[PDB]
Coordinates of C-alpha atoms in Angstrom, one line a residue:
Chain F
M1 CA -15.4 -15.2 -16.8
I2 CA -17.5 -16.3 -19.8
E3 CA -18.9 -19.6 -20.7
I4 CA -17.5 -21.4 -23.8
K5 CA -19.4 -24.4 -25.0
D6 CA -17.4 -24.9 -28.2
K7 CA -14.2 -26.2 -26.8
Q8 CA -11.7 -25.2 -29.5
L9 CA -8.7 -26.3 -27.4
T10 CA -10.0 -29.8 -26.6
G11 CA -7.3 -32.4 -26.7
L12 CA -4.5 -29.9 -26.4
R13 CA -2.0 -29.6 -23.5
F14 CA -0.6 -26.3 -22.1
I15 CA 1.8 -25.2 -19.4
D16 CA 1.3 -22.2 -17.3
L17 CA 4.5 -20.4 -16.5
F18 CA 4.5 -17.4 -14.0
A19 CA 1.0 -18.8 -13.3
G20 CA 0.2 -16.4 -10.5
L21 CA -3.4 -17.0 -9.6
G22 CA -3.9 -19.3 -12.5
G23 CA -5.7 -16.9 -14.8
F24 CA -4.3 -18.5 -18.0
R25 CA -5.3 -21.9 -16.6
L26 CA -8.9 -20.8 -16.1
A27 CA -9.0 -19.4 -19.6
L28 CA -7.4 -22.3 -21.5
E29 CA -9.3 -24.9 -19.5
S30 CA -12.6 -23.1 -20.3
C31 CA -11.7 -23.9 -23.9
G32 CA -11.1 -27.5 -23.2
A33 CA -7.3 -27.5 -22.9
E34 CA -5.4 -29.6 -20.3
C35 CA -2.8 -28.1 -17.9
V36 CA 0.2 -30.4 -17.7
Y37 CA 2.6 -28.2 -15.8
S38 CA 2.5 -24.9 -13.9
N39 CA 5.1 -22.8 -12.3
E40 CA 4.7 -19.9 -9.9
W41 CA 7.4 -18.1 -7.9
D42 CA 5.4 -16.4 -5.1
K43 CA 4.5 -18.6 -2.2
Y44 CA 1.2 -16.8 -1.4
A45 CA 0.3 -17.1 -5.1
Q46 CA 1.2 -20.9 -5.0
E47 CA -1.1 -21.1 -1.9
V48 CA -4.2 -19.6 -3.5
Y49 CA -3.4 -21.5 -6.7
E50 CA -3.4 -24.7 -4.7
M51 CA -6.7 -23.8 -3.0
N52 CA -8.3 -23.5 -6.4
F53 CA -6.7 -26.2 -8.6
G54 CA -5.6 -28.9 -6.1
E55 CA -1.9 -28.8 -6.9
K56 CA 0.9 -26.5 -6.0
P57 CA 2.8 -25.0 -8.9
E58 CA 6.5 -25.7 -9.1
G59 CA 8.6 -22.8 -7.8
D60 CA 11.7 -21.0 -9.2
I61 CA 11.6 -21.8 -12.9
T62 CA 15.4 -21.2 -13.0
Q63 CA 16.0 -24.5 -11.0
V64 CA 13.8 -26.3 -13.5
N65 CA 15.6 -27.9 -16.4
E66 CA 13.7 -27.5 -19.7
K67 CA 14.2 -31.2 -20.5
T68 CA 12.0 -32.0 -17.6
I69 CA 9.1 -29.9 -18.8
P70 CA 6.2 -32.1 -20.0
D71 CA 5.4 -32.1 -23.7
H72 CA 2.7 -29.5 -24.4
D73 CA 1.0 -27.7 -27.3
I74 CA 0.6 -24.2 -25.9
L75 CA 3.0 -22.4 -23.6
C76 CA 1.4 -19.6 -21.5
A77 CA 3.2 -16.9 -19.6
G78 CA 2.2 -13.6 -18.1
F79 CA 5.8 -12.9 -17.4
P80 CA 7.6 -10.0 -15.6
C81 CA 8.7 -7.1 -17.8
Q82 CA 12.5 -6.8 -17.6
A83 CA 15.1 -4.8 -19.6
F84 CA 17.7 -6.7 -21.6
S85 CA 21.3 -5.6 -21.8
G86 CA 17.5 -11.7 -30.0
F87 CA 17.8 -15.1 -28.3
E88 CA 21.2 -14.5 -26.7
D89 CA 20.2 -10.9 -25.9
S90 CA 17.4 -12.3 -23.7
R91 CA 19.7 -14.1 -21.4
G92 CA 19.7 -13.2 -17.7
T93 CA 16.0 -12.4 -17.7
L94 CA 12.9 -14.4 -16.8
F95 CA 12.0 -14.2 -20.5
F96 CA 15.0 -16.4 -21.2
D97 CA 13.4 -19.1 -19.2
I98 CA 10.5 -19.0 -21.6
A99 CA 12.9 -18.9 -24.6
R100 CA 14.9 -22.0 -23.4
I101 CA 11.7 -24.0 -22.8
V102 CA 10.3 -23.0 -26.2
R103 CA 13.5 -24.1 -27.8
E104 CA 13.5 -27.5 -26.1
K105 CA 9.8 -28.3 -26.2
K106 CA 8.7 -26.5 -29.4
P107 CA 5.0 -26.0 -28.5
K108 CA 2.6 -25.1 -31.3
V109 CA 1.7 -21.8 -29.7
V110 CA 3.3 -19.4 -27.3
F111 CA 0.8 -17.1 -25.6
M112 CA 2.1 -14.2 -23.5
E113 CA 0.8 -11.2 -21.8
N114 CA 2.4 -8.0 -20.4
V115 CA 1.8 -4.4 -19.4
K116 CA 0.3 -1.9 -21.8
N117 CA 3.5 0.1 -22.2
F118 CA 5.6 -3.0 -23.0
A119 CA 5.9 -1.8 -26.6
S120 CA 7.6 1.3 -25.3
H121 CA 9.9 -0.1 -22.6
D122 CA 13.7 0.3 -23.1
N123 CA 12.9 2.6 -26.0
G124 CA 11.2 -0.2 -27.8
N125 CA 13.7 -3.0 -27.8
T126 CA 12.3 -5.1 -24.9
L127 CA 9.6 -5.8 -27.4
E128 CA 12.1 -6.1 -30.2
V129 CA 14.2 -8.7 -28.3
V130 CA 11.1 -10.7 -27.5
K131 CA 9.9 -10.5 -31.1
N132 CA 13.3 -11.4 -32.5
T133 CA 13.8 -14.2 -30.0
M134 CA 10.4 -15.7 -31.0
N135 CA 11.3 -15.3 -34.7
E136 CA 14.7 -17.0 -34.3
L137 CA 12.9 -19.9 -32.5
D138 CA 10.8 -20.3 -35.6
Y139 CA 7.6 -18.6 -34.5
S140 CA 5.5 -15.9 -35.9
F141 CA 4.8 -12.9 -33.6
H142 CA 1.4 -11.2 -33.2
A143 CA 1.0 -8.5 -30.6
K144 CA -1.8 -6.1 -29.8
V145 CA -2.8 -3.9 -26.9
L146 CA -6.3 -4.8 -25.8
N147 CA -8.4 -3.0 -23.2
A148 CA -10.5 -5.0 -20.8
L149 CA -13.5 -2.6 -21.2
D150 CA -13.7 -3.6 -24.9
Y151 CA -14.2 -7.3 -23.9
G152 CA -17.0 -7.3 -21.4
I153 CA -15.1 -6.3 -18.3
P154 CA -15.7 -2.9 -16.7
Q155 CA -12.1 -2.0 -16.0
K156 CA -9.7 0.4 -17.6
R157 CA -6.9 -2.0 -18.2
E158 CA -4.8 -2.1 -21.4
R159 CA -2.3 -4.9 -21.7
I160 CA -0.2 -6.3 -24.5
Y161 CA -1.1 -9.8 -25.7
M162 CA 1.5 -11.7 -27.8
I163 CA 0.6 -14.8 -29.7
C164 CA 3.2 -16.9 -31.5
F165 CA 2.6 -19.8 -33.8
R166 CA 5.3 -22.3 -34.8
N167 CA 6.0 -21.6 -38.5
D168 CA 5.6 -25.2 -39.7
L169 CA 1.9 -25.1 -38.9
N170 CA 1.5 -22.3 -41.5
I171 CA -1.1 -20.4 -39.5
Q172 CA -2.2 -17.3 -41.5
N173 CA -5.7 -16.5 -40.1
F174 CA -5.1 -15.7 -36.5
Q175 CA -7.0 -12.7 -35.4
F176 CA -7.3 -10.8 -32.2
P177 CA -10.9 -10.9 -31.0
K178 CA -13.0 -7.9 -32.1
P179 CA -14.1 -5.4 -29.4
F180 CA -17.8 -5.3 -28.4
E181 CA -20.2 -3.1 -26.4
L182 CA -19.7 -3.1 -22.6
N183 CA -22.8 -4.3 -20.8
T184 CA -21.5 -4.8 -17.3
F185 CA -20.4 -2.0 -15.0
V186 CA -18.8 -1.8 -11.6
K187 CA -22.2 -1.5 -10.0
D188 CA -23.1 -4.9 -11.3
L189 CA -20.2 -6.5 -9.5
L190 CA -20.6 -5.1 -6.0
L191 CA -21.1 -7.1 -2.7
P192 CA -23.8 -6.0 -0.2
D193 CA -22.8 -3.0 2.0
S194 CA -22.5 -5.3 5.0
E195 CA -19.6 -7.3 3.6
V196 CA -17.5 -4.2 2.8
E197 CA -18.1 -2.0 5.8
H198 CA -14.4 -2.4 6.8
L199 CA -13.4 -0.9 3.5
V200 CA -15.2 2.3 4.0
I201 CA -13.1 5.4 4.7
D202 CA -14.9 8.4 6.2
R203 CA -12.8 11.5 5.7
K204 CA -13.4 15.1 6.5
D205 CA -11.1 16.2 3.6
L206 CA -13.4 14.5 1.1
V207 CA -14.5 16.8 -1.6
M208 CA -17.2 15.6 -4.0
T209 CA -16.7 17.4 -7.3
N210 CA -19.4 15.8 -9.5
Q211 CA -22.9 14.4 -9.1
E212 CA -23.5 10.6 -9.5
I213 CA -24.3 9.8 -13.1
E214 CA -27.7 8.5 -14.4
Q215 CA -26.5 6.3 -17.2
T216 CA -23.8 3.6 -17.2
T217 CA -20.9 4.6 -19.3
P218 CA -17.8 2.7 -20.5
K219 CA -15.3 5.0 -19.0
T220 CA -13.9 5.9 -15.5
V221 CA -16.0 8.6 -14.0
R222 CA -14.4 10.6 -11.2
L223 CA -16.8 12.0 -8.6
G224 CA -14.5 13.3 -5.9
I225 CA -11.1 13.4 -4.2
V226 CA -9.6 13.2 -0.8
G227 CA -6.4 15.0 0.4
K228 CA -4.3 16.2 -2.5
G229 CA -6.4 14.3 -5.1
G230 CA -3.5 12.2 -6.3
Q231 CA -2.9 8.4 -6.6
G232 CA -5.3 6.4 -4.4
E233 CA -7.0 9.7 -3.5
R234 CA -9.7 9.7 -6.1
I235 CA -13.4 8.6 -5.9
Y236 CA -15.1 7.0 -8.9
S237 CA -18.7 6.2 -10.0
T238 CA -19.8 2.5 -9.9
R239 CA -21.9 3.4 -13.0
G240 CA -18.6 3.7 -14.9
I241 CA -15.8 1.2 -15.2
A242 CA -13.1 0.5 -12.6
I243 CA -9.8 2.3 -12.6
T244 CA -6.8 0.1 -13.2
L245 CA -6.1 -2.3 -10.3
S246 CA -2.6 -1.8 -9.1
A247 CA -0.6 -4.4 -7.1
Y248 CA 1.7 -1.8 -5.5
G249 CA 0.0 1.6 -5.6
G250 CA -0.3 3.7 -2.5
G251 CA -2.7 6.3 -1.2
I252 CA -5.8 6.3 1.0
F253 CA -7.7 4.1 -1.6
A254 CA -4.5 2.2 -2.5
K255 CA -4.7 -0.7 -5.1
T256 CA -8.4 -0.4 -5.9
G257 CA -9.2 3.3 -6.0
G258 CA -12.2 4.6 -4.1
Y259 CA -15.8 4.3 -5.1
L260 CA -19.0 6.1 -4.1
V261 CA -21.2 3.3 -3.0
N262 CA -24.6 4.0 -1.3
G263 CA -23.5 7.4 0.2
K264 CA -20.1 6.0 1.3
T265 CA -16.6 6.1 -0.2
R266 CA -14.7 2.8 0.0
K267 CA -12.1 0.6 -1.6
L268 CA -13.2 -2.4 -3.6
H269 CA -13.4 -5.8 -1.8
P270 CA -11.0 -8.6 -2.9
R271 CA -14.1 -10.4 -4.4
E272 CA -15.0 -7.3 -6.3
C273 CA -11.3 -7.2 -7.5
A274 CA -11.7 -10.8 -8.6
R275 CA -14.8 -9.9 -10.6
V276 CA -13.3 -6.9 -12.3
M277 CA -10.4 -9.1 -13.4
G278 CA -12.9 -11.7 -14.7
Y279 CA -12.3 -14.3 -12.0
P280 CA -15.4 -16.5 -11.3
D281 CA -17.1 -16.4 -7.9
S282 CA -16.1 -20.1 -7.6
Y283 CA -12.5 -18.8 -7.3
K284 CA -11.3 -18.7 -3.7
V285 CA -9.3 -15.5 -3.0
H286 CA -6.4 -15.2 -0.6
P287 CA -7.5 -14.8 3.1
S288 CA -5.3 -11.7 3.4
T289 CA -7.1 -8.6 1.9
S290 CA -3.8 -6.9 1.2
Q291 CA -2.3 -10.0 -0.4
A292 CA -5.5 -10.4 -2.5
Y293 CA -5.2 -6.8 -3.8
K294 CA -1.5 -7.4 -4.8
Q295 CA -2.4 -10.7 -6.5
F296 CA -5.3 -9.3 -8.5
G297 CA -3.6 -6.0 -9.3
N298 CA -0.8 -8.2 -10.8
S299 CA -3.0 -10.7 -12.6
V300 CA -4.5 -11.2 -16.1
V301 CA -8.0 -10.4 -17.2
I302 CA -9.6 -13.8 -17.7
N303 CA -12.2 -12.8 -20.3
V304 CA -9.7 -11.4 -22.8
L305 CA -7.5 -14.5 -22.5
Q306 CA -10.6 -16.6 -23.2
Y307 CA -11.5 -14.8 -26.4
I308 CA -7.9 -15.0 -27.5
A309 CA -7.6 -18.7 -26.5
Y310 CA -10.7 -19.4 -28.5
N311 CA -9.2 -17.7 -31.5
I312 CA -6.0 -19.6 -31.1
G313 CA -8.0 -22.8 -31.2
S314 CA -9.9 -21.5 -34.2
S315 CA -6.7 -21.0 -36.1
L316 CA -5.2 -24.3 -35.1
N317 CA -8.3 -26.2 -36.1
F318 CA -8.7 -24.7 -39.6
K319 CA -6.8 -27.3 -41.6
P320 CA -8.5 -27.7 -45.0
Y321 CA -7.2 -30.1 -47.7
Chain X
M1 CA 10.1 4.6 25.3
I2 CA 12.4 5.9 28.1
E3 CA 12.1 5.6 31.8
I4 CA 11.2 8.7 33.8
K5 CA 11.4 8.6 37.6
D6 CA 11.2 12.3 38.1
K7 CA 7.5 12.7 37.3
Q8 CA 7.4 16.4 36.5
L9 CA 3.7 16.3 35.4
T10 CA 2.4 14.6 38.6
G11 CA -0.9 16.1 39.6
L12 CA -1.8 17.4 36.2
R13 CA -4.7 16.3 34.0
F14 CA -4.5 16.0 30.2
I15 CA -6.7 15.2 27.3
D16 CA -5.7 13.2 24.3
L17 CA -7.4 14.4 21.1
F18 CA -6.9 12.6 17.7
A19 CA -5.4 10.0 20.1
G20 CA -4.6 7.4 17.5
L21 CA -2.7 4.7 19.3
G22 CA -2.4 6.8 22.4
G23 CA 1.2 7.9 22.0
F24 CA 0.6 11.1 23.8
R25 CA -1.0 9.2 26.6
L26 CA 2.0 7.0 27.0
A27 CA 4.4 10.0 27.1
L28 CA 2.4 12.1 29.5
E29 CA 1.6 9.2 31.8
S30 CA 5.2 8.4 32.0
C31 CA 5.8 11.9 33.4
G32 CA 3.1 11.4 36.0
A33 CA 0.1 13.0 34.3
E34 CA -3.4 11.6 34.3
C35 CA -5.5 11.2 31.2
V36 CA -9.1 12.5 31.7
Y37 CA -10.4 12.3 28.2
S38 CA -9.5 10.8 24.9
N39 CA -10.9 11.1 21.4
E40 CA -10.1 9.1 18.3
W41 CA -12.0 9.1 14.9
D42 CA -10.8 5.8 13.5
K43 CA -12.6 2.6 14.6
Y44 CA -9.5 0.4 14.4
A45 CA -7.5 2.9 16.3
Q46 CA -10.1 2.9 19.0
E47 CA -9.8 -1.0 19.2
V48 CA -6.1 -1.1 19.8
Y49 CA -6.3 2.0 22.1
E50 CA -8.9 0.0 24.2
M51 CA -6.7 -3.1 24.1
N52 CA -3.9 -1.1 25.7
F53 CA -5.7 1.4 28.1
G54 CA -8.9 -0.5 28.9
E55 CA -11.1 2.3 27.6
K56 CA -12.5 3.3 24.2
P57 CA -11.9 6.9 23.2
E58 CA -14.9 9.0 22.2
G59 CA -15.5 9.3 18.4
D60 CA -16.1 12.3 16.0
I61 CA -14.7 15.3 17.8
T62 CA -16.7 17.7 15.6
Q63 CA -19.9 16.5 17.2
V64 CA -18.6 16.8 20.8
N65 CA -19.7 19.8 22.8
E66 CA -16.6 21.7 24.0
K67 CA -18.4 22.5 27.3
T68 CA -18.6 18.8 28.1
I69 CA -14.9 18.2 27.8
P70 CA -13.3 17.5 31.2
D71 CA -11.2 20.2 32.9
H72 CA -7.5 19.7 32.1
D73 CA -4.1 21.3 32.3
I74 CA -2.7 20.0 29.1
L75 CA -4.4 19.5 25.8
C76 CA -2.6 17.1 23.4
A77 CA -3.3 16.7 19.8
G78 CA -1.4 15.0 16.9
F79 CA -3.8 16.4 14.3
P80 CA -4.3 16.0 10.5
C81 CA -2.6 18.8 8.6
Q82 CA -5.2 20.7 6.5
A83 CA -4.9 23.8 4.3
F84 CA -6.8 26.9 5.4
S85 CA -8.5 29.5 3.1
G86 CA -6.1 33.8 12.3
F87 CA -8.9 32.0 14.3
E88 CA -11.6 32.5 11.6
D89 CA -9.4 31.0 8.9
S90 CA -9.2 27.7 10.8
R91 CA -12.9 27.0 10.2
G92 CA -13.6 24.1 8.0
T93 CA -10.6 22.3 9.5
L94 CA -10.0 19.8 12.4
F95 CA -7.8 22.5 14.0
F96 CA -10.9 24.5 14.5
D97 CA -12.1 21.8 16.9
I98 CA -8.8 22.2 18.9
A99 CA -9.3 26.0 19.0
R100 CA -12.9 25.9 20.1
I101 CA -12.0 23.4 22.9
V102 CA -9.0 25.6 23.9
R103 CA -11.2 28.7 24.0
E104 CA -13.7 27.1 26.4
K105 CA -11.4 25.0 28.6
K106 CA -8.3 27.3 28.8
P107 CA -5.7 24.6 29.5
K108 CA -2.4 25.7 30.9
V109 CA -0.7 24.1 27.9
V110 CA -1.5 23.0 24.4
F111 CA 0.9 20.4 23.1
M112 CA 0.5 19.6 19.3
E113 CA 2.5 17.6 16.7
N114 CA 2.3 17.5 12.9
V115 CA 4.3 16.7 9.8
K116 CA 7.8 18.2 9.2
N117 CA 6.8 20.4 6.3
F118 CA 3.9 22.0 8.4
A119 CA 6.2 25.1 8.6
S120 CA 6.3 25.5 4.8
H121 CA 2.8 24.3 4.1
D122 CA 0.5 26.7 2.1
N123 CA 3.7 28.8 2.1
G124 CA 3.8 29.4 5.9
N125 CA 0.1 30.2 6.0
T126 CA -0.9 27.0 7.7
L127 CA 1.5 27.5 10.6
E128 CA 0.7 31.2 10.7
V129 CA -3.0 30.4 11.1
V130 CA -2.2 28.0 14.0
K131 CA 0.2 30.5 15.7
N132 CA -2.1 33.5 15.3
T133 CA -5.1 31.5 16.6
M134 CA -3.2 30.4 19.7
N135 CA -2.1 34.0 20.2
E136 CA -5.7 35.2 19.9
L137 CA -6.7 32.6 22.5
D138 CA -4.1 34.2 24.8
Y139 CA -1.3 31.6 24.4
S140 CA 2.4 32.0 23.6
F141 CA 3.5 29.8 20.7
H142 CA 6.7 27.7 20.4
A143 CA 7.4 25.4 17.5
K144 CA 10.4 23.4 16.3
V145 CA 11.0 20.5 13.9
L146 CA 12.8 17.7 15.7
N147 CA 14.1 14.5 14.2
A148 CA 13.6 11.2 16.0
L149 CA 17.2 10.2 15.3
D150 CA 18.4 13.0 17.5
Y151 CA 16.4 11.7 20.5
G152 CA 17.5 8.1 20.8
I153 CA 15.2 6.6 18.1
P154 CA 16.7 5.1 15.0
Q155 CA 14.3 6.5 12.4
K156 CA 14.6 9.3 10.0
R157 CA 11.5 11.2 11.1
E158 CA 11.2 15.0 11.4
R159 CA 8.0 16.3 12.8
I160 CA 7.0 19.7 14.1
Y161 CA 6.2 20.0 17.7
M162 CA 4.1 23.0 18.9
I163 CA 3.9 23.9 22.5
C164 CA 1.7 26.8 23.8
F165 CA 1.5 28.2 27.3
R166 CA -1.4 30.3 28.5
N167 CA -0.1 33.9 28.8
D168 CA -1.0 34.4 32.5
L169 CA 1.5 31.7 33.5
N170 CA 4.3 33.9 32.1
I171 CA 6.4 30.9 31.0
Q172 CA 9.7 32.3 29.7
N173 CA 12.0 29.4 29.9
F174 CA 10.5 26.6 27.8
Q175 CA 13.1 24.8 25.8
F176 CA 13.0 22.0 23.4
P177 CA 15.1 19.0 24.4
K178 CA 18.7 19.1 23.3
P179 CA 19.6 16.4 20.8
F180 CA 22.1 13.6 21.7
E181 CA 24.2 10.9 20.2
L182 CA 22.2 7.9 18.8
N183 CA 23.3 4.6 20.3
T184 CA 20.4 2.4 19.1
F185 CA 19.9 1.2 15.5
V186 CA 17.4 -0.8 13.5
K187 CA 19.4 -4.1 14.1
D188 CA 18.9 -3.6 17.9
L189 CA 15.1 -3.5 17.5
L190 CA 14.6 -6.5 15.2
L191 CA 12.6 -9.7 15.9
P192 CA 14.1 -13.1 15.5
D193 CA 13.8 -14.4 11.9
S194 CA 11.2 -17.0 12.9
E195 CA 8.7 -14.3 13.7
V196 CA 9.1 -12.5 10.4
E197 CA 9.5 -14.9 7.5
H198 CA 6.0 -13.9 6.3
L199 CA 7.4 -10.4 5.6
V200 CA 10.3 -11.7 3.5
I201 CA 10.2 -10.7 -0.2
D202 CA 12.2 -12.9 -2.6
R203 CA 12.8 -11.1 -5.9
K204 CA 14.9 -11.2 -9.1
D205 CA 15.1 -7.6 -10.0
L206 CA 17.0 -6.9 -6.8
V207 CA 20.1 -4.9 -7.5
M208 CA 22.5 -4.4 -4.6
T209 CA 24.8 -1.3 -5.0
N210 CA 26.7 -1.6 -1.7
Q211 CA 27.7 -4.4 0.6
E212 CA 26.4 -4.6 4.1
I213 CA 28.2 -2.0 6.2
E214 CA 30.3 -2.9 9.3
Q215 CA 29.8 0.3 11.2
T216 CA 26.6 1.6 12.8
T217 CA 25.5 5.0 11.6
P218 CA 22.7 7.5 12.4
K219 CA 21.7 7.7 8.7
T220 CA 19.6 5.8 6.3
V221 CA 21.9 3.5 4.4
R222 CA 20.5 2.3 1.1
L223 CA 22.1 -1.0 0.0
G224 CA 19.9 -1.8 -3.0
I225 CA 16.8 -1.3 -5.1
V226 CA 14.1 -3.3 -6.7
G227 CA 12.2 -2.4 -9.9
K228 CA 12.8 1.3 -10.6
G229 CA 14.1 2.2 -7.2
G230 CA 11.3 4.6 -6.2
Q231 CA 9.0 4.6 -3.3
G232 CA 8.9 1.3 -1.4
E233 CA 11.5 -0.1 -3.8
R234 CA 14.6 0.6 -1.7
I235 CA 16.5 -1.8 0.5
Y236 CA 18.3 -0.4 3.6
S237 CA 20.8 -1.6 6.1
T238 CA 19.6 -2.4 9.6
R239 CA 23.0 -1.0 10.9
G240 CA 21.6 2.4 10.0
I241 CA 18.3 4.0 11.0
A242 CA 14.9 3.2 9.7
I243 CA 13.5 5.1 6.7
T244 CA 10.4 7.2 7.6
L245 CA 7.4 4.9 8.2
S246 CA 4.4 5.8 6.0
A247 CA 0.7 5.1 6.5
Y248 CA -0.2 5.2 2.8
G249 CA 3.1 4.6 0.9
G250 CA 3.1 2.1 -1.9
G251 CA 5.7 -0.1 -3.5
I252 CA 7.0 -3.6 -3.0
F253 CA 8.2 -2.7 0.4
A254 CA 5.3 -0.3 1.2
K255 CA 4.9 1.5 4.5
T256 CA 8.2 0.3 6.1
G257 CA 10.6 0.1 3.3
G258 CA 12.8 -2.9 2.7
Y259 CA 15.7 -4.1 4.9
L260 CA 18.6 -6.5 4.4
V261 CA 18.3 -8.9 7.3
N262 CA 20.4 -12.1 7.6
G263 CA 20.7 -12.5 3.9
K264 CA 17.0 -11.8 3.2
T265 CA 15.1 -8.6 2.1
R266 CA 12.0 -7.9 4.1
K267 CA 9.6 -5.3 5.4
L268 CA 9.6 -4.5 9.1
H269 CA 7.1 -6.3 11.3
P270 CA 4.5 -4.1 13.0
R271 CA 6.3 -4.8 16.3
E272 CA 9.5 -3.4 14.8
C273 CA 7.5 -0.5 13.6
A274 CA 6.3 0.0 17.2
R275 CA 9.9 -0.1 18.4
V276 CA 11.1 2.4 15.8
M277 CA 8.3 4.7 16.9
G278 CA 9.3 4.3 20.6
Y279 CA 6.3 2.2 21.6
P280 CA 7.1 -0.2 24.5
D281 CA 7.0 -4.0 24.0
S282 CA 4.1 -4.0 26.4
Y283 CA 2.0 -2.1 23.8
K284 CA -0.2 -4.5 21.9
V285 CA -0.3 -3.8 18.1
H286 CA -3.4 -4.2 16.0
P287 CA -4.3 -7.9 15.2
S288 CA -4.4 -6.8 11.5
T289 CA -0.9 -6.4 10.1
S290 CA -2.0 -4.0 7.4
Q291 CA -4.0 -1.9 9.9
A292 CA -1.0 -1.8 12.2
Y293 CA 1.2 -0.4 9.5
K294 CA -1.3 2.4 8.8
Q295 CA -1.4 3.2 12.5
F296 CA 2.3 3.3 13.2
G297 CA 2.9 5.1 9.9
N298 CA 0.7 7.9 11.1
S299 CA 1.7 7.9 14.8
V300 CA 3.9 10.0 17.1
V301 CA 7.4 9.2 18.3
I302 CA 7.0 8.4 22.0
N303 CA 10.5 9.3 23.2
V304 CA 10.4 12.8 21.6
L305 CA 7.1 13.5 23.3
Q306 CA 8.5 12.3 26.6
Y307 CA 11.4 14.7 26.5
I308 CA 9.1 17.5 25.5
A309 CA 6.5 16.6 28.2
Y310 CA 9.3 16.6 30.8
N311 CA 10.4 20.1 29.7
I312 CA 6.8 21.4 29.7
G313 CA 6.7 20.2 33.3
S314 CA 10.1 21.7 34.1
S315 CA 8.8 25.1 32.9
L316 CA 5.4 24.8 34.7
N317 CA 7.2 23.9 37.9
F318 CA 9.8 26.7 38.0
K319 CA 7.9 29.3 40.0
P320 CA 10.3 31.4 42.1
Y321 CA 9.2 34.2 44.4

C-alpha cells in the first residue's frame, strides 16, 4: 500500500460490492473517500473483512434491493467473470446486480476490476456486454490491462481495470496512471525464516536449474523445479518478482509458487501474499493459511487501485469555469 | 478397514518404510504381524503417526545405514514414483534405498505399492527397473493394478501392488485377492451435517446436469460442475463412489472433489477421506485440515493391503511335505 496525503476523494461516498478482503475499500479510503455500504458473498471473507473494518459486509447481493442501497458517488466492484447468453443481455449474471444498482443510484463513477483475459472471454463479448451496458446506462467506458509490476508491486499480475464516468459530468481527462520503475522485490517482503519453517518443502526430486541472481530484476526468475516441473512445481528467485498468486491452483507449491529462500524451497506465507498484493501489515489475515491463500489469490492489488482512485479524483476535481 | 481373526502373519516381523500415516502398519498388524521399524520423511506425517502408534518413525531413509535396520520378514514400502535413467539404474532414486536395504536384510517378502500408471511410466522402464532389481536381489516379482472399488471401498483408486518373495521360499501360489461386489458407498461414510458446514461451498456458477440418483452404483457419478468443469470443479453424487483423492490437486473442490450432500455442495471432511481410504474411526487425523488432505491424498487403501497381506501369509504358510 502507498501513502496518499493529497486526498482527492475527500467528501465522496463509495460502495464496495464483491468486497472480498476490502481491497477497494483500503484504496478509496486512502484517498479520503467514505465507505457507505459493502457487500461480500463469502462467509470467510466477511469474517476477515469484519476483523479489519469493524463491520460485516451484507451477504448475497441478489437478496438486496437496489432501492435500499445508500446514495453514493463511486461504485466499486471486483466482480466475478461470467459469460452472458447490452443491459438486458447482462441479466442472470452477477454483473447484472452492478447494472441494476447503477441504474437506480446513478453514481458519478463505476470502478471495476477483473482478470487479464477479460477482454478475450466469450470471444470478446463479455467485455462488449459490460461496455454496452455501461454506455446504455449513460456512462463512458475506459478499460486497460495494467500489470502490478509496473506500479511498485513485485508480482506478475495483469488485470483489467474499467473506469466509467456518468456522461453529464463531462469528464474528458481521465488517464490510467503511468507505469514506473519497480524498486521493491520479493526479497524485500519476506518474513524471517523462523516464521515460515512450516512452509518449507524438502524434496529429493528438486532440480535446481539456474544459479541465484545477483541483481534484482522486474521479472519472474525460475531457479528450479520439482517433479514434472509444471504448475505449483517451479521455484523462483526472491530477487525477481512473484509469480501470479492463484486462489485455486494446485501442485506442491500450490497458490504461491515456490521460492528459494536462504538455501530452502518454500511457499510464500499468507503475510507475504498480503504484501505482494499490496495489503498493509496492519491488515489482519485469515487464521487459516489455506483460506488466506485463496482470499489473496482472488483479491485486487491495492497499489494499482490507489493510483487509479487518485486519478479518478483528479478528473472529478478538475472543474474550471 | 476389515476385521481379520485368522491372523496369517502371526509371528512375523515387518518394517514400514515411507510409512506416511502407517497404512501398511494397520494392515499388517491386523493380520498378526509386528512392526519392528518405521521410517517417514515428512514431519507432519510423523506427528500423526506418533499420535496413532505411540512412536515417531525415523526420518531421512537415505541417511540410515542398512546394516542398522532390524531383522524382518516383510519389508513394506509405499514409495514415491521416480523416473530412472536393473539395480544400477535405480541409483539417484528413493527405490535405491529399498533395494540396498533388501540386499542387506533379505526379508522373506517385499510388499510395495505405487500409482496406477507405474506400469506405463517411462514407457515400462520404471517397472522394468524395479522388477529386474528385485530379480537380481534373488526375488520373484508379482505386480497387479487393483481398484479400491473392487475391494469394498467406495473410491475410484487404482494403484499398483508389487509383491516379491525371496527365491529360496519357492512360493508358487501367491494370488492377488479376487474382487467382489461393492456394498458400501460414499453416503454410508458421511459425517452428520453439523460436523461439516465449514466445508460447504455456496456458489452461483454451479450447473447441475443430472438430478440426484436413486440407485447406488459402483461408479463416480458426476451431477454438476462449477466454473469450467475441470479439476476440482466437479460435483459428484454420494450414492456413487468417491473420485480419487489427491494430495496436490487444485480447484474449488481441491483434493476431495465436490459432493452433493443434503442440498449443499461440499468437500469431504478429512474423516470422510480416512473412511474412503479404509482408515478406522479410531485413527486420529492430523489436527490441520489442509495437512490431513495431503496425507490421505497420498496414502494407501487399507482394505486392499489387508487382503494382500492375508494372501502373502496364506502363501508363506502353505508348506507341505
